[PDB]
Design a protein around this ligand. Structure first.
Ligand SMILES: CCOC(=O)Cc1nn[nH]n1
Ligand SMILES: [Zn+2]
Length: 258
């Protein structure tokens, strides 16, 4: 009876093993565009991915993680609301059973078909395990997906999924360039929050891009052929692996843009 996204182990149950589920800075949240205030003091965001080294893609039974070499400062996020240097460790997605849901963050209650999370750790804490124990430990870049024109830079991800169908399967995933997954604009919302899966630690500076990327129906259909289950177990399609919006509580969402 491990946590997951089913009727018996889904987000409404998580607080039993992880009481911080009902904490003061949980994610995701609804971004109310009429409430989020332009902050003229936010610096522009610095996304430095030219030296990024992808290694591996893993079905962890909740999502698939594209993992990067984070042993030196190769792929980093700086500026915006951040102090210092945050190293890219992995990216993954959350997605729906259908195009009308799947994002974790919502915009004026609108759900996107999917949401990309590029997870970075603060290099002043030395390792990822120590960073998650700190309020400023992680920076997650959130990007909404909508369904329309294919995203070319996502296709190398889509075409390896056949090979990692079930929990615990991985494959070599070298030389993938995450710059191919960004929108044109780096206009963003920011607020302090948490991991959106157990252990739900309150260690994240959230940076959610305003401009979604387009992916094709055929691309997201291939996300929905993945399995939550391990090899030879009853097939549970990997769909609706999103946590719903949490109470904002004592928090301000700041906009990078007028
Ligand atoms: O990092 C993040 O992506 C936030 C999150 N935590 N688990 N899945 N997503
Ligand atoms: Zn995530």
């Amino acid at each position: 009876h491990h946590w997951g996204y089913g009727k018996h182990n889904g987000p409404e149950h998580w607080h039993k093993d992880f009481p911080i589920a009902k904490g003061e800075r949980q994610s995701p949240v609804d971004i109310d565009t009429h409430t989020a205030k332009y902050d003229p003091s936010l610096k522009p965001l610095s996304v430095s991915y030219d030296q990024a080294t992808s290694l591996r893609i893993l079905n962890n039974g909740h999502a698939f993680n594209v993992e990067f070499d984070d042993s030196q400062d190769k792929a980093v996020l700086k500026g915006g609301p951040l102090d210092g240097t945050y190293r890219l460790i992995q990216f993954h997605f959350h997605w729906g059973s259908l195009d009308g849901q799947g994002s974790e963050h919502t915009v004026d209650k609108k759900k996107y078909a999917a949401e990309l999370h590029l997870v970075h750790w603060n290099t002043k804490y030395g390792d990822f395990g120590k960073a998650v124990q700190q309020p400023d430990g992680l920076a997650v870049l959130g990007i909404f997906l909508k369904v329309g024109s294919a995203k070319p830079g996502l296709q190398k991800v889509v075409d390896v999924l056949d090979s990692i169908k079930t929990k615990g399967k991985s494959a070599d995933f070298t030389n993938f360039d995450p710059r191919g997954l960004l929108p044109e604009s780096l206009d963003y919302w920011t607020y302090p929050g948490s991991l959106t899966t157990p252990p739900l630690l309150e260690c994240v500076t959230w940076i959610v891009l305003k401009e979604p990327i387009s992916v094709s129906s055929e691309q997201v259909l291939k996300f929905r052929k993945l399995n939550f289950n391990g090899e030879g177990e009853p097939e549970e399609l990997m769909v609706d692996n999103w946590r719903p919006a949490q109470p904002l509580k004592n928090r301000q969402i700041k906009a990078s843009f007028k």
